[PDB]
Short mmCIF file of C-alpha atoms and ligand atoms in Angstrom, two decimals:
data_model
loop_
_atom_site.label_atom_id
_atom_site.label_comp_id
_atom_site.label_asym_id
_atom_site.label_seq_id
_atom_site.Cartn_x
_atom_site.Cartn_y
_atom_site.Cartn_z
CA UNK A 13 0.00 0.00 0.00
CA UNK A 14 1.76 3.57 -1.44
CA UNK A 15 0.41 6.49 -0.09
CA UNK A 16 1.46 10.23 -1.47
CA UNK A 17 0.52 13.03 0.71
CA UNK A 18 1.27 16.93 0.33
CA UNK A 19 1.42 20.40 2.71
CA UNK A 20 2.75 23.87 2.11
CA UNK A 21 6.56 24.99 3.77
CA UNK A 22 6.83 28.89 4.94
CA UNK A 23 9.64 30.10 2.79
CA UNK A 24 11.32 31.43 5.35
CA UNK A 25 11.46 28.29 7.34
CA UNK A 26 12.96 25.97 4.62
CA UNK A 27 16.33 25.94 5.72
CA UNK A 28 15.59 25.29 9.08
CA UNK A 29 12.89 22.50 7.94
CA UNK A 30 16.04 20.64 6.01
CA UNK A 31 17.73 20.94 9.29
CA UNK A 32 15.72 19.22 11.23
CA UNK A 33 14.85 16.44 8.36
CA UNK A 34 18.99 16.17 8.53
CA UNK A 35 18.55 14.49 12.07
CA UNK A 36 15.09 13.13 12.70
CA UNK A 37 14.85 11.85 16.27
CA UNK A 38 15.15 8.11 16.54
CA UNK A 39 12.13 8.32 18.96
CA UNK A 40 10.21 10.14 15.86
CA UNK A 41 11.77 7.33 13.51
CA UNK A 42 10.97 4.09 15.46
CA UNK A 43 7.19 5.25 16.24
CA UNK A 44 6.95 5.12 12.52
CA UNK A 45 8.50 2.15 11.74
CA UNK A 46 6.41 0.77 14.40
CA UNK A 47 3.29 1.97 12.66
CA UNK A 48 4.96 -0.11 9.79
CA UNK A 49 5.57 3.23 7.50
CA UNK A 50 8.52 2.21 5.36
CA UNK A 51 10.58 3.59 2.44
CA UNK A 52 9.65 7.16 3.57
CA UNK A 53 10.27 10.28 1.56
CA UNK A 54 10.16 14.30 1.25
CA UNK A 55 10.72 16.19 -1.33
CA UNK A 56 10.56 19.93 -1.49
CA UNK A 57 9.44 22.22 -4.75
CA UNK A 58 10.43 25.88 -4.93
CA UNK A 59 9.35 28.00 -5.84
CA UNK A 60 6.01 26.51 -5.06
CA UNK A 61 6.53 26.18 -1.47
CA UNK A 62 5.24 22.26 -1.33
CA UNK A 63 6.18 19.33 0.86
CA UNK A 64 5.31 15.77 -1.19
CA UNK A 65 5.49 12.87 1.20
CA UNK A 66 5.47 9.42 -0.35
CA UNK A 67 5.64 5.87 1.60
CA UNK A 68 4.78 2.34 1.72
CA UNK A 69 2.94 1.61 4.89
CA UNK A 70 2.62 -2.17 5.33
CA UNK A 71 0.05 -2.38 8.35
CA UNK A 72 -3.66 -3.67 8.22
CA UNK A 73 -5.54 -0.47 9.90
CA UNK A 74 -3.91 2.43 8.58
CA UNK A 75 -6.13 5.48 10.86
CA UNK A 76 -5.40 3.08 13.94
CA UNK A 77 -1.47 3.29 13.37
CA UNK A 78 -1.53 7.02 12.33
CA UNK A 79 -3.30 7.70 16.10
CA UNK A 80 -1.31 5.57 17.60
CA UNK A 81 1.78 8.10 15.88
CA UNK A 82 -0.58 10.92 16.89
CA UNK A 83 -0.58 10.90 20.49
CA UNK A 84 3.07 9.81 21.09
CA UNK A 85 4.57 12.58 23.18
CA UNK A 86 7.73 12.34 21.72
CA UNK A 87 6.54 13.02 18.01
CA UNK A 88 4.02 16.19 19.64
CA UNK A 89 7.21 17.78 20.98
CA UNK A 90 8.65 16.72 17.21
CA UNK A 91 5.60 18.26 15.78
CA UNK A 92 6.29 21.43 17.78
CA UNK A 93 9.42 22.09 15.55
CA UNK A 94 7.93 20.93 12.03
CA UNK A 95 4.77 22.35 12.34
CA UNK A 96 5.60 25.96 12.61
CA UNK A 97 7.73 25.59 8.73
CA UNK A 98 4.47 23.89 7.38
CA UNK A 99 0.99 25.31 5.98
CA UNK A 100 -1.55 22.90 5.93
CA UNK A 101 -3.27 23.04 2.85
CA UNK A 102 -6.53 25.36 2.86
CA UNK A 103 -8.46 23.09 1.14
CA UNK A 104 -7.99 20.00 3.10
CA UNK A 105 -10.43 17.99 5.12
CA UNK A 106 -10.71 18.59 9.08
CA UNK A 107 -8.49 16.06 10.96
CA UNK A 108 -5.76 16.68 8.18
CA UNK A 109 -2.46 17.99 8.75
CA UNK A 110 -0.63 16.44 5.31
CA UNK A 111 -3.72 16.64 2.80
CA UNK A 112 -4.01 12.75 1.01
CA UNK A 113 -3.60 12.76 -2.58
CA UNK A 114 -5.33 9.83 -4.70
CA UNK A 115 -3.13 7.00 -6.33
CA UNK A 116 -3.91 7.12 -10.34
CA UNK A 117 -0.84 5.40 -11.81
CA UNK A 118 1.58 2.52 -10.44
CA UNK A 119 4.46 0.02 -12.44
CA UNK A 120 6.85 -1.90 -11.04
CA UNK B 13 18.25 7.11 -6.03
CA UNK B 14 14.61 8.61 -5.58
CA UNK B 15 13.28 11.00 -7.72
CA UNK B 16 10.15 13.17 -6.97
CA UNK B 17 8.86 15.69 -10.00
CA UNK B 18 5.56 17.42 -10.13
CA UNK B 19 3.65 19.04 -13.02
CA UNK B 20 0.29 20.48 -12.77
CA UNK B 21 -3.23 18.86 -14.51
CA UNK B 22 -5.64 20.41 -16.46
CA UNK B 23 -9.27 19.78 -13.99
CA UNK B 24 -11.35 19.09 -17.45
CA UNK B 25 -8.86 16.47 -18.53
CA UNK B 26 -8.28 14.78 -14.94
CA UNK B 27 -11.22 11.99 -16.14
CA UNK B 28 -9.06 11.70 -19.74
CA UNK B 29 -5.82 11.44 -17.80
CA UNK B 30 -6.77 8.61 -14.76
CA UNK B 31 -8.32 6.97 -17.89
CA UNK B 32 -5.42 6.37 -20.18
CA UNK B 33 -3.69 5.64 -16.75
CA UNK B 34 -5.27 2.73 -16.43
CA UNK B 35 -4.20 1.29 -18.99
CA UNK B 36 -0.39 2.68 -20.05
CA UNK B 37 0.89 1.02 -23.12
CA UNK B 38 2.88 -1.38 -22.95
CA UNK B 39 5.41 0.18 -25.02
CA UNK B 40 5.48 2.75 -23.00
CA UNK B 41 6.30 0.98 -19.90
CA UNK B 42 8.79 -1.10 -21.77
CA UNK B 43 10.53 1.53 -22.65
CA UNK B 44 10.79 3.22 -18.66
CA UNK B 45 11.83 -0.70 -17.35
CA UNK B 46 14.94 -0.40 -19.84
CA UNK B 47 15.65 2.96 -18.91
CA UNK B 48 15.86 1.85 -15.68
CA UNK B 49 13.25 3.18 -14.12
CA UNK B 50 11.04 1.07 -11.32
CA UNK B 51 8.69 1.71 -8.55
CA UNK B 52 7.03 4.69 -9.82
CA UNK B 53 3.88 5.91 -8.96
CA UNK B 54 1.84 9.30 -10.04
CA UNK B 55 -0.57 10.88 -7.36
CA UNK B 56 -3.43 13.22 -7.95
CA UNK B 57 -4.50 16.10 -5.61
CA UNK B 58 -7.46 17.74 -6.03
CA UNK B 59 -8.29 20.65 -5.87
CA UNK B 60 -4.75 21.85 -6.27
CA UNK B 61 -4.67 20.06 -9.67
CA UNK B 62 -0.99 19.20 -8.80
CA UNK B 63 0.23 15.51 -10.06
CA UNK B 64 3.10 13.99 -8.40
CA UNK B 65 5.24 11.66 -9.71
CA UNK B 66 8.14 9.39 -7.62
CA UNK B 67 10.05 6.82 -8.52
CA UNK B 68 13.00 4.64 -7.91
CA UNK B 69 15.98 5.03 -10.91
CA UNK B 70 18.56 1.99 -10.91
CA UNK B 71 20.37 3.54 -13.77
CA UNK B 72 24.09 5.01 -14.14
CA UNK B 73 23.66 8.22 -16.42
CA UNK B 74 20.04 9.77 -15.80
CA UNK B 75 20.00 12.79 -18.35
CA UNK B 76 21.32 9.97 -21.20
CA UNK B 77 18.49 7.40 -19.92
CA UNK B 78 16.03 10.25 -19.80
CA UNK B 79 17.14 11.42 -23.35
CA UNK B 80 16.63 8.30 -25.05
CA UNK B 81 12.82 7.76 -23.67
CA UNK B 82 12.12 11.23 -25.24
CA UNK B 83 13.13 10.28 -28.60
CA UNK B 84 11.28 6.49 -28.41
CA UNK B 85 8.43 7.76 -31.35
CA UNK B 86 5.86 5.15 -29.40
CA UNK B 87 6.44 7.20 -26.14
CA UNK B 88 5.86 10.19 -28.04
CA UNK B 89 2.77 9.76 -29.33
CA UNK B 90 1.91 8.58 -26.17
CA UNK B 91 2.86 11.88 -24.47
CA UNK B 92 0.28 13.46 -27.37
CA UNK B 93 -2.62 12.20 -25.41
CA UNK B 94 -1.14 13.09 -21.68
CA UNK B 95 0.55 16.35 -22.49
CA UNK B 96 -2.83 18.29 -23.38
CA UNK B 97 -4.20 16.76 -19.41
CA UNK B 98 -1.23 18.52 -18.16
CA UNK B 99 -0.26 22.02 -17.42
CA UNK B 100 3.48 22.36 -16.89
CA UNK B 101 4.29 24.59 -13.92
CA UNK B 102 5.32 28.01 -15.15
CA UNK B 103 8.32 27.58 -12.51
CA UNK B 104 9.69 25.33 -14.22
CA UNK B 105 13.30 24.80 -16.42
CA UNK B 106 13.97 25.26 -19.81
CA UNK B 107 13.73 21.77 -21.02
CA UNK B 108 11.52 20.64 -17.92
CA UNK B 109 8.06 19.19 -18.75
CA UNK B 110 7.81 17.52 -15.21
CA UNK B 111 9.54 19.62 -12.80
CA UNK B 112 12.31 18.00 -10.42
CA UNK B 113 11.85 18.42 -6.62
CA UNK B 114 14.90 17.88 -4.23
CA UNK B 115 14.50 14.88 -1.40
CA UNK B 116 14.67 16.31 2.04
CA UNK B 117 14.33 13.50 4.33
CA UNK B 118 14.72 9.77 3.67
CA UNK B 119 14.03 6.73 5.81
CA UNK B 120 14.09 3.26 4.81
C1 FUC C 201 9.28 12.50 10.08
C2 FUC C 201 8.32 13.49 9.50
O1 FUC C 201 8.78 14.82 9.94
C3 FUC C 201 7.87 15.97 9.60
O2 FUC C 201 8.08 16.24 8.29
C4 FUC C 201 6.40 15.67 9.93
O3 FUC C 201 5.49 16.62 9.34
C5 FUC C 201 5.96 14.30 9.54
O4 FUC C 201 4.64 14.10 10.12
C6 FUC C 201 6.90 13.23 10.00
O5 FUC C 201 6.90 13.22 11.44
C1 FUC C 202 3.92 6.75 -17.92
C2 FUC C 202 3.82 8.22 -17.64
O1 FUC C 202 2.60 8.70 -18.30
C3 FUC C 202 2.40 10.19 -18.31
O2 FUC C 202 1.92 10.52 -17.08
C4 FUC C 202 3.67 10.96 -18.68
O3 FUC C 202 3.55 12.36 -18.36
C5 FUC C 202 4.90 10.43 -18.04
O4 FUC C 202 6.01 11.10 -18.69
C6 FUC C 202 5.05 8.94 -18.20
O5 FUC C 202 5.16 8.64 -19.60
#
C-alpha cells in the first residue's frame, strides 16, 4: 500500500525544515516504523513552497497506526518544531495535517 | 536514487488522464523498465490540480536514460494524449516538462 501526501513549507522556514529532516529523532523514527511506515520520503518544490510525502505503509488499519503516531509525546514535541515551517493546505479535510492525494498510476 | 517531480493537470482532462492511466501502453512501460526506471507511482491532488510523480531510478547516467525515452516515437505519441491533461508549472526549467523536486528526508 503507497500512499502520497502533500502540505505547504513557509519560505522562510525551509532551511531550518532541512535541518531538522537532517537528524530526525530516533524516537520520531521508530514510532513510525512501528506503525509499519517504510521507504519514507520528502521532497521539497520551490518555488512553489510544497512538501510531497510518499511511503509504503505495510500495516492492516492504517487510521489506527496514524493515532497511535498521533498521540506519542515524543513526536508532539517533534511536531512542535515541524509544524511551525508547514501550511496545511486550505483546502484540506478537518483532521488533516498532510492533505491525502489519490493514487492514479503505479508500475513496477 | 529517488526522484520526486511534479507538473500540474488540467481539472477538465483529470477523467481523460486517470483513464489512459489505467491502462499505459505497454510500449510505453517497456521503454521506462529499460531505462531503468522502477517503482514509480503518479498521485493526484485535487483541488490543487498538482500531479506527483516518484520513482526509484537503478540507472548510471540519468540525463542519457532520460534522453533516449524522449526520442522512443511510441512514447511520443503517447505523451500526445497526456501532455494536453497537463499544465506544466510556469516555474519550471527550460527543457523541464515535469519539474524536479529535491529529497529532504529519507528513511528506509
Ligand atoms: C518525520 C516526518 O517529519 C515531519 O516532516 C512531519 O510533518 C511528519 O509528520 C513526520 O513526522
Ligand atoms: C507513464 C507516464 O505517463 C504520463 O503521465 C507521462 O507524463 C509520463 O512522462 C510517463 O510517460
Amino acid at each position: 500500500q503507497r500512499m502520497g501526501m502533500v502540505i505547504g513549507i513557509k519560505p522562510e522556514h525551509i532551511d531550518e525544515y532541512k535541518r531538522l529532516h537532517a537528524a530526525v529523532w530516533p524516537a520520531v523514527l521508530a514510532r513510525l516504523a512501528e506503525a509499519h511506515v517504510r521507504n519514507y520520503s520528502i521532497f521539497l518544490r520551490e518555488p512553489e513552497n510544497l512538501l510531497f510525502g510518499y511511503w509504503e505503509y505495510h500495516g492492516t488499519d492504517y487510521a489506527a497506526d496514524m493515532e497511535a503516531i498521533a498521540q506519542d509525546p515524543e513526536t508532539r514535541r517533534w511536531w512542535t518544531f515541524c509544524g511551525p515551517c508547514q501550511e496545511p493546505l486550505a483546502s484540506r479535510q478537518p483532521g488533516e495535517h498532510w492533505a491525502h492525494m489519490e493514487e492514479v498510476f503505479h508500475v513496477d
